[PDB]
Structures are given as C-alpha cells and as structure tokens.
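Teaching assistant here, posting this on the class forum so everyone can see the example we discussed in section. The complex has four components, and the goal was to see what a joint structure prediction looks like when all of them are supplied at once.
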Amino acid sequence: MFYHISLEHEILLHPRYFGPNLLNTVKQKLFTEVEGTCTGKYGFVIAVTTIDNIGAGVIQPGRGFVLYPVKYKAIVFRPFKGEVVDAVVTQVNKVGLFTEIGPMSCFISRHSIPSEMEFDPNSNPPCYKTMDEDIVIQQDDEIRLKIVGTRVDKNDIFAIGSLMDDYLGLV
Amino acid sequence: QKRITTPYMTKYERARVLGTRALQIAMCAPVMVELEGETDPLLIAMKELKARKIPIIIRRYLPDGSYEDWGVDELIISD
Amino acid sequence: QSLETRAEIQELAMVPRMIIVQDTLTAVRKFTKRDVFLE
Amino acid sequence: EEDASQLIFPKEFETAETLLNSEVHMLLEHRKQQNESAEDEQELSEVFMKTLNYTARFSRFKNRETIASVRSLLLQKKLHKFELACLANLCPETAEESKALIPSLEGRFEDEELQQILDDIQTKRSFQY
C-alpha cells in the first residue's frame, strides 16, 4: 500500500564534499541512500517527493564524518498483513502462482489456491485453470489476493498470499 | 545571541577543532586560506584558526540542556 | 592511530604542559658560584 | 501482531495519508520528469520503474479531476483513511464485494449506503477504449 510519510535519515557526508554549497551535495546524496532501497520497517521507498528540512551537521569525533539529520517526504510501499490487493502474475510453476505486487514479488502456494484449480503443464503458457475452465490465471494476469503474512529477508520484504477467501481470483 | 558563555575559546575546544579540521584536510577537504607549501595537515588548520576561516561551529551544551552556537571566528583565540 | 586524538594529545597532553635531575642541580650550584670562570 | 483486517498496524502510519494507484503515478511522473531533464543524475532505480508500471496498469482514473472528485466524495463520509485508498484501488463491483474484501467496512457501513458509493466510483473510473 502507498502512503505519504515524513522519515528521518542520518546522512554521512565525507569531508571531500565540504566545498561551496555543500548543502546541495547533501540534498543530492539523499536521492541515492533512501531512494530505491527497501527498509524492512516501512517497506520499499519507491520515490521521494520533496525535502522537509536539513538539520545541523554534527561532526562525529574521531571518525571525522559529519552527520546530517535530514527530514524528507517520500512514498513507501508497506504490505500490511491480512490485506487484499491486486497483483500481477510473473510466472507459474507446479509449486504455485508467482505474483508481483508492485515493487515486491508475492508467492502463492498450491494449497492456498482453491482445490478446483489444477496446474496444467501442457498448455502453453502455463496457467492454473480449473476443470470447468470458467476461470484461468495466465501470466501477467490481474488477480486479487490476500496477503496472509509477510517476512523480511536480506533487506527485502517477501509476501505470501492466498485465494481461499471469497471473491479472490481474476475478478 | 543571548550567549552567556565566555567569549574566549578553551584549550580543549582549540585542540578538538584543529584535530577535526586537520583530519578533514587530510580527507581532501577544501582550505579557505592560501596554501604556501604547508604539507602537514595540522599546520594548514593552525593558520586557518589564526585567519578565522574554520567553518566548524562549536555547540556548547549547557548542563541544563540548552546549547549555544559559538563560531570559531567569533571566539577570541590566544596566539 | 586516529589523527584527531593525535592532534589533541600533542596540544594538551604533552610534557611541557604537564610540568631537574639531581646530577644537574648539584652542578648548577657549582656553575653559578662566583669562583667559576670560563675561558 | 499487525493485521489490516482488524485495522491494527504501527502507530507511525496513522499520521500518513493514503494515496491512490493512479494518483501515485502522477507523483512518480513528477519525480520522473525532474530527474530526466531538470538535473543530470544517474538513471532512476529499478524499484521506481517497477512501481511505475504497476500504477499505470492499475490506474483507474484519467486525470486529477477524476481523482480529486473521488477523493472528495469519499472524504465526506466516515471512511477510514486506510479504506480510502483500498476501496478506490480495489474498485469493488458491488457492496457485497467490498465488505468481504474489506472487513472493516462491514462494521460501520450498511448494505445500501455503500452500494451508492461503489457505483459512484464506477461512474468516475474509465477504460482506455
């Protein structure tokens, strides 16, 4: 889910960037540290809108690196537990559907998929189709799923979804 | 403003300001004053203090929790 | 190892700011005696 | 210890205001425009590109006027901010669809009034064709 937040990040600036208008270097540095990363607590930081203010630069003793506490406005993608959201299928395997909820990738287990669905390896491309053939989930298909739980791994958020709940599928 | 601390600069502040500046100078930091062949980083920072050009601002934390921003140039050094 | 503490040590922790052997004081008394004359 | 169905989540997100998938695309477009031309900077991160396609593909509104109208329409009600973007993003077809997908709405919304809200969203969302 997308939100508007005001976060705090301590920027480490080398003394080499102590030239004229050093605040510009701090401002542009913030567009690389917190931009494009994925904090485990607030989720993926997809983009930064604007900068609120830049705090006083405190010089760390011994290290010699000036620390600049800067406040900025950014939009994060935090998948809340037990939240239903649309997803895009990227690949399909016998284990289960592999979905893509925006920046992150969510995996759907075979058990979570309704029993009526049955994986078909012969059909090109693979797609979880039930016997009645009423609903089929191909690749790059807009499907709605509920995230039962989310886990944070290697500075990234991995989500597990399910379609057992009512009205979860192609619609 | 309304600063109550002594105008002079303490020896401890002078040592840390020069030490931190000297470390910064050794890290390819710019030098405000003109360079006349002084290789040793401490000498570069020492003359910077004499000319009152060090950008470092001393934030003296009072025991009551308040802080005062005293500039190195504003403070009266002893030479 | 650090330059910052090295700079601080040389500014406040040096021997001159911290402050004679007995082999010199005895000779100093003899040295300043009016009898002593140096060519 | 947090669950979206029960409206329990970290206290920090309470101050945050939700955004629509189509609306976020506009914000990403504004970020994309300045980076591309305003400043000479490294190319945008792969994460930014991935979400841009996700928002564009699932964008339910054409222009800001449609986005603002839906935002204003839903703001008049007691809809919680979490449901504000969730309802608009999901675009439930009928009232029964939304309550099952959004358990919170069932708490303070009747089967009739909410139906009059979802259908309003339908009149605002438009297709490419």
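For the discussion questions: Chain C is about 60% helix and 0% strand. Residues 3-12 of chain C form the longest helix (10 residues). Think about how each of these relates to the inputs above.
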